[PDB]
Amino acid sequence: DAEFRHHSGY
Amino acid sequence: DAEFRHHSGY
Ligand SMILES: [Zn+2]
Ligand SMILES: [Zn+2]
Numbered sequence: 001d002a003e004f005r006h007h008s009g010y
Numbered sequence: 011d012a013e014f015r016h017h018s019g020y
Contacts, residue, residue, distance in 0.1 A: 006016045 001016070003013065003016075006011065
């Protein structure tokens with residue numbers, strides 16, 4: 001995965 | 011964390 005996948009936030 | 015931190019190995 002990538003940074004966007006590893007990092008989550010809504 | 012970064013790609014290097016998220017992932018492991020060579
Ligand atoms: Zn990654
Ligand atoms: Zn990251």
